[PDB]
Amino acid sequence: ADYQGKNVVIIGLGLTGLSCVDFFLARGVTPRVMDTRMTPPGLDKLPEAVERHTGSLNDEWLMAADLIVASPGIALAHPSLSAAADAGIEIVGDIELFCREAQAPIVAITGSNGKSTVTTLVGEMAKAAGVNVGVGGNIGLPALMLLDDECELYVLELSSFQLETTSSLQAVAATILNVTEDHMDRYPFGLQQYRAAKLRIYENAKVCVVNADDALTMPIERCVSFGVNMGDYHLNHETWLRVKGEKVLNVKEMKLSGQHNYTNALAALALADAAGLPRASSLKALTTFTGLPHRFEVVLEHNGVRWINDSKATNVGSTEAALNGLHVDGTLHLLLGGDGKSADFSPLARYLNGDNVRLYCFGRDGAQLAALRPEVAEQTETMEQAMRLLAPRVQPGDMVLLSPACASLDQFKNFEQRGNEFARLAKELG
Ligand SMILES: CC(=O)N[C@H]1[C@@H](OP(=O)(O)OP(=O)(O)OC[C@H]2O[C@@H](n3ccc(=O)[nH]c3=O)[C@H](O)[C@@H]2O)O[C@H](CO)[C@@H](O)[C@@H]1O[C@H](C)C(=O)N[C@@H](C)C(=O)O
Ligand SMILES: Nc1ncnc2c1ncn2[C@@H]1O[C@H](COP(=O)(O)OP(=O)(O)O)[C@@H](O)[C@H]1O
Numbered sequence: 484a485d486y487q488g489k490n491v492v493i494i495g496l497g498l499t500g501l502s503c504v505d506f507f508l509a510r511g512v513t514p515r516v517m518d519t520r521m522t523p524p525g526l527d528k529l530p531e532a533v534e535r536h537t538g539s540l541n542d543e544w545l546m547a548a549d550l551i552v553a554s555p556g557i558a559l560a561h562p563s564l565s566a567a568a569d570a571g572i573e574i575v576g577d578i579e580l581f582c583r584e585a586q587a588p589i590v591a592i593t594g595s596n597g598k599s600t601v602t603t604l605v606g607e608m609a610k611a612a613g614v615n616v617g618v619g620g621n622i623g624l625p626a627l628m629l630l631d632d633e634c635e636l637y638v639l640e641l642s643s644f645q646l647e648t649t650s651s652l653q654a655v656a657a658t659i660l661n662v663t664e665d666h667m668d669r670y671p672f673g674l675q676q677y678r679a680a681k682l683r684i685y686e687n688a689k690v691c692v693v694n695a696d697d698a699l700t701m702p703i704e705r706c707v708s709f710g711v712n713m714g715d716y717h718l719n720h721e722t723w724l725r726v727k728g729e730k731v732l733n734v735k736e737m738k739l740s741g742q743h744n745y746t747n748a749l750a751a752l753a754l755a756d757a758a759g760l761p762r763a764s765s766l767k768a769l770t771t772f773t774g775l776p777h778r779f780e781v782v783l784e785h786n787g788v789r790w791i792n793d794s795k796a797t798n799v800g801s802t803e804a805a806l807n808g809l810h811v812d813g814t815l816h817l818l819l820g821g822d823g824k825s826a827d828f829s830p831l832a833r834y835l836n837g838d839n840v841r842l843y844c845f846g847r848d849g850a851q852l853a854a855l856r857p858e859v860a861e862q863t864e865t866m867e868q869a870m871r872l873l874a875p876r877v878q879p880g881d882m883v884l885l886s887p888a889c890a891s892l893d894q895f896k897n898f899e900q901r902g903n904e905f906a907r908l909a910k911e912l913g
């Protein structure tokens with residue numbers, strides 16, 4: 484696309500906004516950037532030639548724009564952005580800009596949970612085939628930083644927020660892995676509005692890959708499906724990955740475990756197949772992939788205690804996936820809390836009954852989580868306080884699990900900081 488001579492306004496001075504600034508500048512367009520935060524994290528990394536407005540959205544700048552580029556962290560429903568849209572001013576995000584430029588096939592992955600895992604897996608499958616692959620998006624490397632003429636395949640993790648502002652994605656293979664309550668602070672019309680944002684990913688996708696066990700992943704010829712007991716890609720039994728009844732991998736060969744990680748492997752294989760990656764090398768990558776930091780990651784096993792960093796469990800579904808069927812020989816010391824994004828945490832309570840569960844609840848919505856079972860729950864302001872509280876009580880056989888069911892931004896830079904903090908404190912206290 485062409486942007487020369489346009490009045491371009493970027494909203495958001497985080498990672499996305501800064502990548503958009505660099506994007507336009509490299510194309511001969513000087514954009515202006517604003518953020519409702521008074522002191523946004525990217526202020527200090529902004530080029531000095533770039534005009535910036537902080538502490539509010541500036542309607543003089545918005546209502547004058549030819550193009551508004553909204554970071555995923557600002558809601559389209561923000562009154563200033565809603566007014567601009569009412570005026571017919573074009574609003575896109577960074578993923579829209581990327582799609583307009585990308586010259587290699589795109590595999591696009593969304594869903595409430597599992598996105599980074601499946602995105603990284605498909606990347607490893609492409610690397611195993613010797614494809615020059617660019618991996619990014621909501622996983623943490625801004626998509627515009629991937630644009631590379633040597634790049635042969637893009638694998639994008641996409642959030643529902645990113646999809647809201649995207650209209651030119653025509654993925655070679657796209658999936659919604661699952662849809663469970665999340666981000667309700669951004670979706671005032673509830674689960675179906677959130678789902679609608681995710682269903683945009685299938686528009687003009689060559690192959691759509693759905694979860695046969697989750698109806699909300701399905702759009703309106705047919706999608707390929709993956710599932711546990713059913714699907715074009717499904718599980719057999721010892722557990723096997725199968726594709727239409729044919730065994731392709733005994734999961735004893737994988738470094739990941741857990742049923743959701745087996746279905747993540749199925750989804751990743753389905754996308755890789757659809758993108759044309761040779762299956763042999765795709766199966767190889769499944770055997771080498773070790774798992775991402777902060778995703779149910781054992782950070783210390785000492786004195787008979789496992790300290791597990793599941794900082795990236797930021798909603799009920801992911802903490803459910805950690806707890807469901809969890810084996811602990813002694814007591815589970817479970818750290819919960821942070822910014823609950825208006826989630827109903829109730830579905831967790833059925834996992835927290837019985838004699839060997841202690842809760843340590845903190846952050847903005849700590850009180851909400853302690854309420855899940857008040858008789859075994861402690862509430863502190865911070866995670867560090869909770870950890871210094873639980874640490875004396877830890878016995879051989881116990882597990883200390885940070886699986887907070889919340890976003891981290893009420894107290895942390897990012898979920899990685901929260902995970903890294905937990906790992907430092909576990910090393911100190913364990
Ligand atoms: C909130 C969000 O969508 N974050 C993704 C974003 O990071 P970035 O630093 O660009 O975020 P941003 O859009 O500036 O928003 C960050 C925070 O600033 C606050 N914010 C932002 C703009 C503004 O004017 N006012 C404001 O208060 C936001 O509400 C938001 O909570 O772009 C990065 C590159 O694509 C992503 O890796 C990053 O994913 C993280 C890890 C995330 O938490 N994403 C959410 C959606 C999730 O996975 O659930
Ligand atoms: N398919 C799945 N369903 C439910 N939880 C999952 C699934 N895959 C992974 N998890 C959990 O989701 C949380 C974040 O995983 P991740 O791969 O980073 O997904 P996302 O990028 O969507 O948050 C981690 O706690 C992890 O164990």
Ligand SMILES: [Mn+2]
Nearest residue numbers: 595642665666
């Ligand atoms: Mn999310």
